[PDB]
Paper text:
Recently, our laboratory introduced the peptidisc as a novel type of peptide scaffold designed to keep membrane proteins stable in solution without detergent. When the peptidisc peptide is mixed with detergent-solubilized membrane protein and the detergent is removed, multiple copies of the peptide associate with the transmembrane domain, embedding the protein in a peptidisc, which can also incorporate lipids that may be bound to the membrane proteins. In addition, we show that peptidisc-stabilized membrane proteins (in this case reconstituted with the conventional ‘on-beads’ method) can be used for high-resolution structure determination by single-particle cryo-EM. Notably, the arrangements of the peptidisc peptides around MsbA and MscS are very different, revealing the structural basis for how the peptidisc scaffold can adapt to membrane proteins of different sizes, shapes and symmetries.
Author numbering:
A (entry chain A), B (entry chain B): 11 to 541
The structure:
Amino acid sequence: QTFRRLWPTIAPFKAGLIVAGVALILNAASDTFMLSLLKPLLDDGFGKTDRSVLVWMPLVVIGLMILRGITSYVSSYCISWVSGKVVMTMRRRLFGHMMGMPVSFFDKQSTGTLLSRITYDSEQVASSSSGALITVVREGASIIGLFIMMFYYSWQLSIILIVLAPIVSIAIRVVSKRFRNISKNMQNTMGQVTTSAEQMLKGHKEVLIFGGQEVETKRFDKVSNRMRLQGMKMVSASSISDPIIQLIASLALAFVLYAASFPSVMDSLTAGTITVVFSSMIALMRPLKSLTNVNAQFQRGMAACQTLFTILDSEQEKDEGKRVIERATGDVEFRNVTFTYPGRDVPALRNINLKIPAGKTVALVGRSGSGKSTIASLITRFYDIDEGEILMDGHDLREYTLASLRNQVALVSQNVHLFNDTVANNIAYARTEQYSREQIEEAARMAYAMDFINKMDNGLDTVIGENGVLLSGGQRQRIAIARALLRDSPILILDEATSALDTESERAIQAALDELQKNRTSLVIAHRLST
Amino acid sequence: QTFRRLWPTIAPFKAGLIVAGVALILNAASDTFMLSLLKPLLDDGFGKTDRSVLVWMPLVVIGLMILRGITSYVSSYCISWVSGKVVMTMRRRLFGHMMGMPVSFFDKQSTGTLLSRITYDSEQVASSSSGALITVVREGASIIGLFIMMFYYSWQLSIILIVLAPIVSIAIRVVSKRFRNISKNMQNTMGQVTTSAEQMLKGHKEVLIFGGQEVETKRFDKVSNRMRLQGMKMVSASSISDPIIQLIASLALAFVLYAASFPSVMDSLTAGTITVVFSSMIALMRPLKSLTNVNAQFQRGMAACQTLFTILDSEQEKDEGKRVIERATGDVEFRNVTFTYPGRDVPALRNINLKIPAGKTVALVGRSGSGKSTIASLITRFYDIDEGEILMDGHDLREYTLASLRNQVALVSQNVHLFNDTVANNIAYARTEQYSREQIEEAARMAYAMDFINKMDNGLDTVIGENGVLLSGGQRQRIAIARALLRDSPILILDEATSALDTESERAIQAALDELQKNRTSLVIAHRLST
């Protein structure tokens, strides 16, 4: 089905994948050929007792197994080539659209969800498609090979087991249908289990506060019981298959035994031939078992890949070209501003008009049910313009190049995110260059955060391995302030945190922000008194 | 190893594993017996051209596959009985000690970590141990019965393949050590990539603000290529495992044929017997490859189970025995109980050996690194105070009513992570104690929560599936206030935030809090001067 979208993404790499099947084909050869040697092994090695000829066979078996080996080698190798490269380009395009996704994309999801999606589902698409081809190639090779074996051995028993093939196959199909139909809603209750445990863990505070230990343990117990029972159902149903499969498969073999009646009274063949027939039967039963599950589970894979596409096929940041905006100061203007993050709410700014002049910064307004803070993120256009008007120097909504804005605007927040690099370069993120560490050094002096860097390792170029989680929030605030210093961004957004900081930290931040509001209009949210 | 710890937890269910092993031995019996009846085929059905046995044996095969079926039935069944029961009790005691876990030791890890621990590690211990037993028992019975088959057919070729098998096992041991090292490396590398991807994702806001997206793409692609190569080498080695095994196995078969040529002198065996030997040998090659990595795999399960035990055997909530069921009020009298949940900076706060006045509530004070809410958490003692106890009214941490401390001292919070139950009983989380739903209505009246009942279904007994995420935080705080009303806590703690609420909401809330401040000393996180 939706392979019409993958095959192109794989098309440049087709050749190697192709190679796989070739070797995979030889697998059956080996299999068949190994089984083939049974005829001379038995019917000639002891029918004719060519004791000497028996020395030919072993070297063959060895070579054939070596063929199995090398074939498996290249199978795994090229299949993994494809698997990787596909996962590669896939996750690349993901990362892309993730970037292209406006932050709204995160309003309806969580990080962990996207981590899971990207990593797991990516790997699963490739693993699926791979095993699909792997097994499919074997089916196209083992089945027909053993068929030819029986053919050049007995047209008759061939005919029989062929007439039997539909029977066993449809049996497998229907029992697999039973299986999957039982596996519809299990995920629901399993996630219910996980989520019950989850909410209890999250709420341990309230839990202890009320000490509902007994009630919650009772809940937990019912949950565990449902877990036990549904797991029982799962494993039972799944297990029954092979019996049922082999059971009816039995009769097939038994019907092959029923060749006692018809062709054996005609002295059908020799013993070793029949040994080949039955060994071949069992061989079939390996990929026979495969085929159906192949179709099903790899349809599942392709469906996961369809989910992936939908994530990609989802619309990126809706930008018809925010044109070109030169870096500039100017003034911020609020003409008839109204905005609702979802439709769930009413206009956050209820038709509000404001003017924030050049360099004349503006602090956290004091109000009730404001939320302007997130509205600053909309001044950064992280979500969609809902209504109203936010103007920059006589220019309407989307004359505003996202890149140009994020350059010219700045954001300082209580929340700060760090990145496993040199914290200096983490500041330098504006192309990570064009700003000598010397300039970064003086910024740190202006950031007043070099004091912490003294405690930090790797000196002035502190490489924050695993981000150096020990780095306090206010340190990160000074970090972002230094970043702003490097960007000379005419527009700033600020925030005051109070987790654990010192008079030196807060007051040096005050001074820094003071210089920042100069020549560059700032937006602030603070808990101080006069400010 | 720690089976010394598991075997008791399973002992009430020995019979399960017992009948499991019985069935598994019967399964091996079925296998061996099919392979055996292979012989009389060639003995008479082609040697003497018999039909009698040529019809007998069909029915035999049928019944024997039915035995495979029923054996698999009870195997899966009882083994799952045990797996479940174990997981059940395991997760049970895991909740238990998990409730007796200090809040700090939560904050040592993350919630998701514990979710994974419980769910996965439980079911993984189960699956591991189960498959371990299944294998060891099947494998053993299969190998021994096949040995017997060869024995009553050829002392000689038996002897040979006996001498041979250890070599196979050693080759497998080597490849499994390769597995060990490549596996630890693979775990390291996949941890790396998931960390990088996530840490990039979370920063989307900042990533945009700096708009360095190309750099993120670069890092993404680097780690992607690293993953490509890592998985490449991983699957490479894991594949290469098989061919080496099958190759040396082939060499073994070759020696078997060298044998066939050496008693080619005597030529005692029958084509049947030959077929039996080789078929059985391939059989072996299934359980051998299994059992080796099985005896390896004990650890995996037992390793996770040891982690579990450590969680159990970790420091549960250590109280010298709190007791004190009776309720009252008295007053609060802290006795130097230290703060250093994460021992990083230094120990700082109030240090009062003093006492707190009755009736009068408690508000919020502003100081650097005050940590009031968590200082309140220690005031509530539900977080582990680092040192000492608390002689309240001359009565220690437990001499004053610790468990009842929850009843005596209320803990309202801004974020009320509620539970997937009836909002009515959500108020009665504390093991509903004949809090008449009439009292629920009247409290919601005293709380001014009756309006949110209209927002919900299920009459005045509103129920919230998935907590009814529709509910905004403010009315949940109001619910918790009503709960405090129900528990008639003379002492309380409250919480005021400013995420999103209305004027009338905050007003009626502060009215209800005054009522709570009335004749009940509380601790109130607030942004106002009402206190």
